[PDB]
């Protein structure tokens, strides 16, 4: 229905705003664009599902997210990709891991404060109906 289309449009507006807020944070610059393969040639070797905030915007705009749960799966992938690719004790790896945990924690905290649970439940019920 047009009411269900309106629901998913509201979802996309909400997710674009959360993603924009993460992308303008200087801590998260490293997560804003895909890893340049020249600069890091073994990335795509090790990381099977690369994810970054520009890709998330692209996926919103392609109507790939029908629930906030599906969006948080891609945020969780940005974090787990960084924990897997940068596991060492050296400060460069520890800094990226801390920034990745902070991205994830920030996205979850914005959604805890600003997503209505009944709006999420509606999206989940429309998604399950297809
Ligand atoms: O080693 C890296 C680089 C980048 I850019 C993102 C995640 N891990
Ligand atoms: O880095 C990886 C992880 C997995 I699971 C399969 C292949 N490469
Ligand atoms: Cl830095």
């Amino acid at each position: 229905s047009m009411q269900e289309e309106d629901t998913f449009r509201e979802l996309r507006i909400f997710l674009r705003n959360v993603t924009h807020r993460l992308a303008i944070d200087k801590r998260f610059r490293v997560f804003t664009k895909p890893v340049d393969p020249d600069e890091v040639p073994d990335y795509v070797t090790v990381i099977k599902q690369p994810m970054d905030l520009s890709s998330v915007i692209s996926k919103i705009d392609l109507h790939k997210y029908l629930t906030v749960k599906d969006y948080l799966r891609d945020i969780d992938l940005i974090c787990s990709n960084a924990l897997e690719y940068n596991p060492d004790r050296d400060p460069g790896d520890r800094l990226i891991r801390h920034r990745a945990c902070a991205l994830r924690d920030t996205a979850y905290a914005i959604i805890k404060e600003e997503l209505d649970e009944d709006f999420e439940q509606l999206c989940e019920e429309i998604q399950e109906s297809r």
Side-chain angles (χ1 to χ4, degrees), residues 45-48 84:
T45 289
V46 173
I47 299 300
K48 297 320 172 170
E84 173 176 351

Side-chain angles (χ1 to χ4, degrees), residues 15-125:
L15 298 179
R16 288 196 199 88
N17 176 262
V18 173
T19 308
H20 181 246
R21 288 155 68 189
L22 297 174
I24 65 178
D25 192 311
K26 284 194 164 158
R27 289 176 292 172
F28 307 145
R29 191 192 158 78
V30 58
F31 304 119
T32 51
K33 288 209 194 314
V35 175
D36 165 30
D38 307 335
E39 193 180 351
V40 194
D42 61 301
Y43 189 75
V44 147
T45 289
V46 173
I47 299 300
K48 297 320 172 170
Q49 286 198 275
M51 188 56 58
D52 67 276
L53 298 170
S54 66
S55 292
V56 168
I57 294 291
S58 289
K59 290 182 65 167
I60 297 167
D61 288 348
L62 290 167
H63 301 196
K64 303 280 204 169
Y65 301 119
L66 299 198
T67 66
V68 178
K69 187 188 268 62
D70 292 339
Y71 172 87
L72 290 170
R73 287 191 239 273
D74 278 350
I75 298 303
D76 283 343
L77 187 57
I78 296 177
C79 181
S80 58
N81 286 344
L83 305 190
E84 173 176 351
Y85 189 72
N86 305 279
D88 291 348
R89 77 95 29 212
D90 62 280
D93 284 13
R94 280 179 167 160
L95 176 58
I96 185 145
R97 293 200 302 277
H98 194 266
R99 290 168 162 177
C101 290
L103 174 65
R104 180 162 182 270
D105 293 347
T106 300
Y108 278 77
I110 292 168
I111 285 159
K112 176 191 185 76
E113 288 202 304
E114 300 179 28
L115 174 59
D116 186 306
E117 66 176 1
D118 289 333
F119 179 81
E120 177 63 0
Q121 184 68 40
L122 175 60
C123 289
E124 290 187 10
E125 292 181 4

